[PDB]
Amino acid sequence: GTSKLKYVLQDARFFLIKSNNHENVSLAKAKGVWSTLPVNEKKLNLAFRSARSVILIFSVRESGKFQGFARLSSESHHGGSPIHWVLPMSAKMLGGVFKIDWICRRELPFTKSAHLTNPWNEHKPVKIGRDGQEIELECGTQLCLLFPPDESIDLYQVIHKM
Ligand SMILES: CNC(=O)c1n[nH]c2ccccc12
């Protein structure tokens, strides 16, 4: 069902993550981590302390789809087991590492979210956005509910964290 998802998403904040390649979304799905540029990592760290949940929604560029979404379970931190991200630029330019819990690892095509606009990007369709763009509450919730259920995920332990 979708009740515990709705509960997780309640009063959440959402941010559009854009990846240049599939390999980085695969590493994120395998290791439960994300790293970004410091201008974005600064935005996420502030959002993490302010919201019950901070939801990242991933799209690989030129893929035409979102690849799922995840919930931040920490602020960024430095000095961890390094992550072999594929970069255009290398290594140091990325800030710290965020720990994330995946809520949906399935894909959603842009064609299915064309009725959702994002007021914080001039009401352009929610698929339109720079890496790190915030998605307003109502658009962001409805977008997450469009994803096919990911039956391999149990939101009980995610709820145990907020
Ligand atoms: C795993 N994180 C990234 O691949 C990433 N995040 N922000 C960026 C900006 C330019 C290029 C790559 C990135």
Side-chain angles (χ1 to χ4, degrees), residues 1-22 24-30 32-51 53-61 63-80 82-91 94-98 100-111 113-129 131-137 139-159 161-162:
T2 72
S3 294
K4 290 196 299 280
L5 171 60
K6 294 189 178 195
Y7 181 82
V8 165
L9 302 185
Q10 216 254 328
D11 295 306
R13 288 180 78 176
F14 310 77
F15 295 85
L16 186 61
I17 297 306
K18 290 267 167 81
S19 192
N20 278 68
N21 42 73
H22 280 291
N24 287 356
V25 171
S26 174
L27 279 146
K29 287 180 177 194
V33 290
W34 191 248
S35 201
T36 188
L37 293 188
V39 60
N40 283 333
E41 168 202 30
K42 269 190 220 77
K43 269 155 60 166
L44 296 169
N45 277 326
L46 278 174
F48 182 75
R49 324 163 173 110
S50 95
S53 319
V54 173
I55 308 289
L56 304 179
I57 322 189
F58 295 80
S59 162
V60 178
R61 304 190 107 109
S63 82
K65 321 180 188 153
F66 310 94
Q67 277 76 36
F69 59 103
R71 185 189 169 276
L72 285 185
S73 69
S74 83
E75 305 192 15
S76 66
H77 293 294
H78 292 269
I83 300 139
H84 295 325
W85 308 112
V86 192
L87 296 167
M89 185 298 143
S90 292
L94 295 168
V97 168
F98 292 84
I100 62 191
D101 300 306
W102 283 92
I103 300 164
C104 183
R105 287 172 170 104
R106 320 250 312 254
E107 301 173 352
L108 179 80
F110 289 172
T111 62
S113 67
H115 66 295
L116 305 174
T117 60
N118 180 4
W120 297 157
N121 197 19
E122 306 176 2
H123 285 101
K124 302 163 166 172
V126 67
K127 77 177 193 180
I128 296 303
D131 180 44
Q133 165 82 64
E134 190 166 347
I135 307 170
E136 183 269 331
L137 192 272
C139 178
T141 301
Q142 285 321 302
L143 174 54
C144 291
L145 297 173
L146 286 173
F147 284 73
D150 185 350
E151 302 197 342
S152 74
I153 272 176
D154 182 356
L155 295 169
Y156 169 85
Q157 298 99 353
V158 182
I159 295 178
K161 314 228 204 162
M162 27 190 308

